[PDB]
Design a protein around this ligand. Structure first.
Ligand code: 675
Length: 245
């Protein structure tokens, strides 16, 4: 997250932190995700398609820092990794960029809700927020595109939704962005999501309800002028999410 503010897991309790174990035993951060139900985390298929072995992933809920054990956190393995069968990647755009991770503790349990671990609600069909709505993102991604290290402390920022018509303008993304994707960005281009934030939530308050409106997917650069962050539109995928859970 470029710009924005430092925060802690009690203010984003649906956020999941997903790491990968390498041969040799080092572990490194991969992507964010969101808790949708005690045993199901939803993220982005591009985060996993090149390393599709479910046994390699570690998922934490309740965790506020990259490298330390936050009180109250919970650690998990992945019982079932489900990637979308029509996922694909062009030069910029990613398609059907959505995945499901069924989670279990070493005793075989799903997440236990608490003050620092909670679900986020899914959207309803054909009801997303209007353009111009402010929504939040969260993640452990890069603070600047030239950094190679990720921030030790969890970050968040707020961005505004952009219409399909504006996002398809030729200096934005043209016909590369489709009606299954949603654009969002800062009007002054000073804060944004970035590499390391993929898979994480775009949460919008709609009609009084905090809602998982999008999943961090792709973008040209980070915080660049006329280059919005682009997000999977979760409401289109409601029949796929129910059928696979
Ligand atoms: N400008 C953004 N909001 C944005 C969003 C997601 C991003 C993801 C990657 C990324 O590296 N994606 C990726 C990694 C591995 C395989 C495929 C894509 C890079 C820049 C981003 C910018």
């Amino acid at each position: 997250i470029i710009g924005g503010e430092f925060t802690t897991i009690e203010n984003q309790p649906w956020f999941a932190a997903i790491y990968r174990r390498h041969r040799g035993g080092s572990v490194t951060y991969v992507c964010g995700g969101s808790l949708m139900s005690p045993c199901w985390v939803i993220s982005a298929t591009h985060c996993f398609i090149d390393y599709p072995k479910k046994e390699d992933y570690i998922v934490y809920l309740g965790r506020s820092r990259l490298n330390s054990n936050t009180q109250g956190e919970m650690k998990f393995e992945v019982e079932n990794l489900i990637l979308h069968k029509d996922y694909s990647a062009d030069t910029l755009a990613h398609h059907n960029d959505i995945a499901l991770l069924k989670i279990r503790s070493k005793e075989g349990r799903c997440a236990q809700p608490s003050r620092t671990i909670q679900t986020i609600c899914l959207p309803s069909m054909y009801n997303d927020p209007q353009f111009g709505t402010s929504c939040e993102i969260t993640g452990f991604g890069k603070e600047q595109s030239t950094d190679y290290l990720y921030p030790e402390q969890l970050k968040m920022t707020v961005v505004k939704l952009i219409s399909h018509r504006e996002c398809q303008q030729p200096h934005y993304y043209g016909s590369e962005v489709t009606t299954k994707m949603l654009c969002a960005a800062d009007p002054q281009w000073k804060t944004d999501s970035c590499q390391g934030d993929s898979g994480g939530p775009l949460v919008c308050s709609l009609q009084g309800r905090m809602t998982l409106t999008g999943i961090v997917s792709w973008g040209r650069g980070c915080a660049l002028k006329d280059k919005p962050g682009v997000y999977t539109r979760v409401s289109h995928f409601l029949p796929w999410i129910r059928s696979h859970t």
